[PDB]
Each structure stands twice: as C-alpha cells, then as structure tokens.
Amino acid sequence: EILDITPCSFGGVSVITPGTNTSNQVAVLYQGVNCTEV
C-alpha cells in the first residue's frame, strides 16, 4: 500500500481586543484556517 504523509498542527491564532479599561470581549482570528473542519 502506498500512503502519503500530510503533516498536522498548523495555522495561527490572532486576538482582537480593546483595552482593559473598556471591555473584556475578545474576537479570535484564525489565520489561514478553514473552520469547517474545526
């Protein structure tokens, strides 16, 4: 049997937030990641 190897654990995590005196809400940006799998 002939099987390819595709490596795992890739893609970045970027955070979008205002200051600590304004709000604690954080928007999370996935970097180059299709979110239908995760």
């Binding site: 490596p7 795992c8 654990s9 890739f10 970045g12 970097q31």
Partner: protein
C-alpha cells in the same frame, strides 16, 4: 516606483522543531531565543500597510 512588499509570517517553533517533545523541552531550557522573529515581521507588516 515600487510601493509595498510581500508580507510574510514565520513561526519559530515549526521551522526549528519537527513537532517532537524533545525539541520543545530543549527550547524551554534556552529561555527564549526567537523573541524577535515575531515582533520584527509584525513591525515590517505594519509599515507595509
């Protein structure tokens, strides 16, 4: 006249280490040596915009 460049982002972990547990444990005994691969390429990418 050229204006902007190609903005890239390089992970310091996945280039040096092959996602092995031995390479990440030796990285924590180094302190941090890659503290400046992330912030310089961020600092280019702000100035490219």
């Amino acid at each position: 006249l050229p204006v902007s460049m190609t903005k890239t982002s390089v992970d310091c972990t996945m280039y040096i280490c092959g996602d092995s547990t031995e390479c990440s444990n030796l990285l924590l005994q180094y302190g941090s040596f890659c503290t400046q691969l992330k912030r310089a390429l961020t600092g280019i990418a702000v100035e490219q915009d």
